[PDB]
Design a protein around this ligand. Structure first.
Ligand SMILES: C[C@@H]1O[C@@H](O)[C@H](O)[C@H](O)[C@H]1O
Ligand SMILES: C[C@@H]1O[C@@H](O)[C@H](O)[C@H](O)[C@H]1O
Ligand SMILES: C[C@@H]1O[C@@H](O)[C@H](O)[C@H](O)[C@H]1O
Ligand SMILES: C[C@@H]1O[C@@H](O)[C@H](O)[C@H](O)[C@H]1O
Ligand SMILES: C[C@@H]1O[C@H](O)[C@H](O)[C@H](O)[C@H]1O
Ligand SMILES: C[C@@H]1O[C@H](O)[C@H](O)[C@H](O)[C@H]1O
Ligand SMILES: C[C@H](O)[C@H](O)[C@@H](O)[C@@H](O)C=O
Ligand SMILES: C[C@H](O)[C@H](O)[C@@H](O)[C@@H](O)C=O
Ligand SMILES: C[C@H](O)[C@H](O)[C@@H](O)[C@@H](O)C=O
Ligand SMILES: [Mn+2]
Ligand SMILES: [Mn+2]
Ligand SMILES: [Mn+2]
Ligand SMILES: [Mn+2]
Ligand SMILES: [Mn+2]
Ligand SMILES: [Mn+2]
Ligand SMILES: [Mn+2]
Ligand SMILES: [Mn+2]
Ligand SMILES: [Mn+2]
Ligand SMILES: [Mn+2]
Lengths: 419, 427, 421, 421
């Protein structure tokens, strides 16, 4: 089924077909002069997919307030319906990331709806950073690293429950992010809390299917404001290495200290085989969870430069999980997810344009200026024509947001859903 | 009224009286050898007050979750009852800061309850960073700087209402903090938004009594994650200077960029007569709103060093409004506010111990090492006995938190108030 | 001519075909957006940024300096090198001097500049280091030093810089000092600032009627605890206190982590105190890296505020533009060339912004389309416009490639003796 | 004796009575808390931290260096000054050397050290600067340089540092390099690290059975975009890859803004890779300021982890302790004296923490009492313990005061020629 009428997509695409042809052919000629086949790039871009977060489909908020828009999804089923729109128009988000218990519902029904909408499911996300009604033990002072054994056991059981749900819908991985930490010096014994965490994660690893992966996600701060158990990639590496081959690290772009060189962290984790995946978003101050590439587009490109280089260096068995983790506080969530997915493909496309042979030469000769310019020649290239053509060829929209607005989808769901 | 039984306070004080006498006399002898009269210091500490936030007596949370404890205060009246405990035990928080509409209630009743509990009211706090039921215009895209004229007018009216309520309860100032800003480049035109803000603030300024102050509070980010209209002290100064004599700047410790020298900002504002007051708290990463001095006690001392220098260099017309602005997510709000107020008095007392003449000499001679050591000699002094004695002589508790726990107050209000339930934070 | 004309011609001809194809393609795309590429190119060829004399030689850190070959020996060699940057990019007609580093007969400096086709931008005083025969040391400060005679000495130095500038064609004085403290208590913040203000007031008195005085703020370094002119707030107080001729200079790498620099730029413009810019890039501190090499979007956002100012009709707005960088691991001439190019790049993209559309989205609070309006301009590869602007003004289509083809570095390496002690 | 014994005796006697009163008062206070002050003093007396040879001379920034009088030049002058710090504080018996800065005949270094009552701590190699007559430059790196011969030269240099150390009593080699990049693309992160790891393996092979190899991470400077050994995560990978004799060195000012450094310390201890510390304080970047002069509580929290490690009976925990600072506006000897004192101050306060009480509050999630348990120790003025520890071991009750009374600075100023009067 199509959430957006096919006649609307066809109409809006035809309206922009002429200009796209001119832009695509122009870029094709430019790339040909540079020894690059535009068709080879478009072919790869069409195959790049990033999972959308169910928790980002509705309007997000802060501790100060939440300003919902119209037609807010009422639950996971409305969220899947909205996710279907993002995938139909961009063709870059076939899978959805779920969070339990936020999206708890009959697994069988979830799968049925997904299949009908043309959507799959990515990594499951457990939730032991908030309390649910009727919960025996509170996570106020922690979960997997809580001082109380019964509380840790409850958190472990919750994670195993997440795996059972995932197995029923087609998921093949579990992502574990917890708020565990301290707000005051002395509140926690750093080593003992980490020892407790490692023991708990070992239990989860024991219950992990042999065709699944277990991802741990580090974060410098928030909700903990003095110390956090899984605070950075160093601790994250120790966790993954300790647990086993099926355990890897997940890197969320906005979870690092000010000025951190994130692309180097990505490179390091790849070298030691522990880069499990990404949580894309952008930021300026803290874990802002803004639209990917809206603040620092070059940084996003540099991260993708490391991913493409890995393939170029001949790294084997490298298939990181790509996911968007954002909060949309002042825009239509669907529109932001659409453009964010587009920006991620944009950075990927540019990274594919880098002349690896030239770059390697400049690195070996220590020609820093030409090396940086080699990256810039790729990054400065406006790859929008490739992104639009990729969408057009695969059933998507040349201009996703414009088509979304022309369809009147938001007004439609606003009438179907309570205010 | 006495939220805490007098017999409990007397009991816990007597139990620690012996140790206090020993420590106070020892410190007195040490200070005497240093040419300082401990009595003179204690006398000033007993008179240092800081306002408590009504929204701080309840458990706080983040966008991810909120984990309420037992006996959570229901409304402003319950909150005032809890604030009364902090003041009775520390004797450092006689005034309370209100936020409207959160604490909206009959001005007559509010004043009546305060007088009964022995509490006064500090600066009023307007709220246009969240929407209230029945609100005609949403503040989603701003308030005082919103592009829609009707929305700015609605925000101006709300602030004027806050002034009216304050006038009725004895308040003498209005603090304006808004979330106004953008999350994306291009979303807002920085200059146009600021022009709108200034014009709206001018309307609010017109409704200020002749003896009132209007405080604008800067904040680098949150809830806006790309730009904020009142983002730093520079913009804040421009605001105060533009509005008039009654407009001043409020400095909240956790609202600055990483590594900012905050004490210098305080000095600069004092020099140009625009330091309206402070919002005390501590932090390590962002606007963490943690207990004052729990993370960086020396920084708190350095801020007070600038304040005492002004309080010593005879800075005429200098009475900054001191207030605690914190969020208590993992502790009993009352206990944290108690120790936070204590830490603020600790930094103040230590600043009073600085040999100003010696410091001036080392500064003039460019003797950096002795100048810094002159500050350290005061800062390293354990002034707890002075704080404890000040509390004891004024009706407080030698050990506030110990006494609070011995009284069983939390268990009491827990039985009187409905049970709470954990939930989300707004994400 | 520092670079043989035949070389510039040969290299331009080699790349003529490709430039034609790219420029014409871009022109058609811009036309579809309602933008005249010729109007943009005409403005770009007139955008100038001053090159720092102190950035023509290899720079270093407190740990070490690794000089390359043919390092300039003095201001005359430096001007000769600046002439190369201007001949090839045509974006750097003026040079920024530092006294006493570049002290020499004003008449001879002017003669060399005229002969090379170069002018002089704002003078830069130096009271952050001690020169020979100095009566008082600047170890503990200069314009804000506790010792009156030391402040007087610093004032005289700045007045001397003005005299030198008047003789060579300069019209402004930039004052950046290291004054500050490394320990709490070392300085009385307020008194140190008052001392600074009194000294600057004296310097202001020596300003010709058509001169400007720029003060430059910096969060830290060389002072590691407090700095007298630490941020734009203090900087504004300075400018406002001194008078109409006094304005603030914004050096991109001088702000706290995560600071919204483009907002500071807008605030200063609103209150008429944006004197100028010191362009460079950074990631950690005052790194002084090549402009746009680390965060190109931020540079574009700064230029977006500068172009918006014109769009709003701000009157008498002519900020001074200067590059202030340190080239530690590259040929200084090549880095200055590409940095000047990046600045024109950001400027050109800022000119492409559809401000009619942007104003609409801002009024309607359409944050997504507003940000996308800025991105449509920023994502545009304007290299063809920069290259054509150079071709038509006597410059090189590919400046660095032409510089390398000329063999200039090897030439000066043979002419200049390297320092031995 | 660098400082006359009569002067030390006189200045101690002058302050003896006051110390007695303060020590007895603190003794009574600690007694009421169940702690024996004599036990704490005994431990403090045994805590030592190495002094940097490169720290007794006045330091500077890339902008300037303002030397004081009697500047030590050469390792012999430096050892003479380091001897003053040890004599007065009794907390710095060993000196950290840097090669080639301190190159000299080992036989003479040892002879001078023995005569002054000084030993030698970890050796520090230097491949972040070029020495005259060097075959290959380190401009673009050293142990991770793309050129094989350059990496070999750097490895040989480090092996030479081990040879010198073996002859003078050292038992470790600390390796800090500037290797990194200033521009994206300049270096391939992974390849550069592979080159570094291979070179370090060669150095590891030359380590005696009882030696340790310390690698030191640093976020930035001299490299301003990326650094090979940028943080503790990379450092851990290095130590674990090299072998049991390789550990990580933590320099306090080498971390990103707001980093929780004490946790990094705890993590390294848990996995047996905490090799040692480089103490100093900072506010902005790698400021290299006097330890505890900016954030004393943070220093205490670091020592809280060190004391807790022993409380838990950790194995393989014998960290080296060294001061790594730059003294730009103070008498280097006085700053090192007070910095060593501040380190012992934090240690003493960490020893006062009631571990039993703390553990109880941690298990019960009583965050407020847990933090107040740390504060009760930290708020305690342990100066009497530090002064008594010095008095009992031949040191000065008030080190800096005694140093000033001795007239030592004026003495060496008269023996050492400055560049200018
Ligand atoms: C973006 C990244 O690029 C390369 O590393 C591989 O193709 C990998 O599968 C992909 O995820
Ligand atoms: C802003 C924040 O809001 C809630 O979480 C609480 O009222 C808390 O005390 C306050 O600090
Ligand atoms: C006494 C006082 O000292 C400083 O604060 C300033 O110089 C101020 O102007 C003066 O009034
Ligand atoms: C790196 C720096 O170099 C010099 O300035 C001095 O040796 C100083 O002590 C050191 O910290
Ligand atoms: C001089 C050098 O400086 C580095 O930044 C690091 O701190 C090293 O430990 C030190 O030896
Ligand atoms: C007494 C004199 O003191 C100097 O400081 C130096 O150590 C000389 O070597 C010694 O002869
Ligand atoms: C909802 C999801 O678990 C969450 O966003 C985490 O992944 C992490 O980003 C939190 O800061
Ligand atoms: C509730 C109160 O208005 C609030 O705390 C503001 O003062 C400011 O700190 C917000 O970040
Ligand atoms: C050389 C010039 O005065 C200097 O670079 C200043 O402008 C400032 O950037 C210093 O950090
Ligand atoms: Mn995430
Ligand atoms: Mn950045
Ligand atoms: Mn997150
Ligand atoms: Mn506040
Ligand atoms: Mn700090
Ligand atoms: Mn706040
Ligand atoms: Mn500058
Ligand atoms: Mn600079
Ligand atoms: Mn070090
Ligand atoms: Mn260092």
């Amino acid at each position: 089924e199509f959430r957006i009428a096919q006649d609307v997509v066809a109409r809006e695409n035809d309206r922009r077909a002429s200009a796209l042809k001119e832009d695509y052919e122009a870029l094709g000629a430019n790339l040909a002069r540079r020894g690059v086949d535009i068709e080879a790039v478009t072919a790869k871009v069409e195959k790049f997919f990033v999972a959308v977060p169910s928790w980002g489909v509705g309007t997000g908020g802060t501790r100060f307030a939440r300003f919902p828009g119209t037609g807010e999804p009422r639950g996971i089923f409305d969220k899947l319906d909205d996710c279907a729109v993002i995938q139909q128009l961009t063709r870059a988000t076939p899978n959805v990331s779920l969070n339990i218990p936020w999206d708890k519902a009959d697994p069988k029904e979830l799968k049925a709806r997904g299949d009908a909408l043309g959507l799959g499911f990515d990594a499951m996300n457990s939730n032991t950073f908030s309390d649910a009604p009727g919960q025996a033990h509170s996570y106020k002072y922690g979960s997997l690293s809580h001082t109380n054994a019964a509380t840790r056991a409850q958190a472990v059981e919750h994670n195993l429950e997440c795996i059972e749900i995932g197995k029923a819908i087609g998921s093949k991985a579990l992502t574990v992010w917890i708020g565990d930490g301290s707000n005051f010096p002395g509140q926690s014994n750093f080593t003992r809390a980490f020892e407790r965490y490692l023991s708990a994660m070992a239990e989860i690893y024991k219950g992990l299917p042999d065709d699944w992966k277990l991802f741990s996600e580090h974060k410098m701060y928030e909700p903990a404001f003095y110390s956090t158990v899984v605070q950075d990639w160093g601790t994250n590496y120790l966790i993954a290495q300790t647990l086993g081959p099926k355990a890897q690290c997940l890197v969320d772009l906005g979870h690092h200290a000010p000025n951190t060189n994130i692309e180097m962290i990505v490179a390091r984790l790849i070298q030691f085989g522990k880069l499990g995946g990404f949580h894309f978003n952008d930021s300026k101050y803290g874990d802002d969870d803004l639209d990917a590439g809206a603040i620092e587009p070059y940084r996003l490109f540099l991260v993708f430069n490391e991913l493409v280089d890995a393939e170029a260096r001949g790294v084997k068995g490298f298939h990181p999980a790509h996911m968007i983790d954002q909060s949309h506080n002042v825009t239509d969530p669907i529109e932001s997810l659409i453009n964010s997915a587009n920006e991620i493909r944009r950075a990927y496309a540019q990274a594919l344009l880098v002349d690896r042979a030239a770059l390697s030469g400049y690195q070996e000769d220590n020609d820093a200026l030409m090396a940086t310019e080699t990256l810039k020649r790729a990054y400065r290239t406006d790859v929008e024509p490739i992104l639009a053509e990729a969408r057009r060829r695969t059933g998507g929209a040349v201009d996703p947001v414009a088509t979304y607005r022309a369809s009147g989808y938001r007004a439609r769901v606003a009438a179907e859903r309570p205010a």
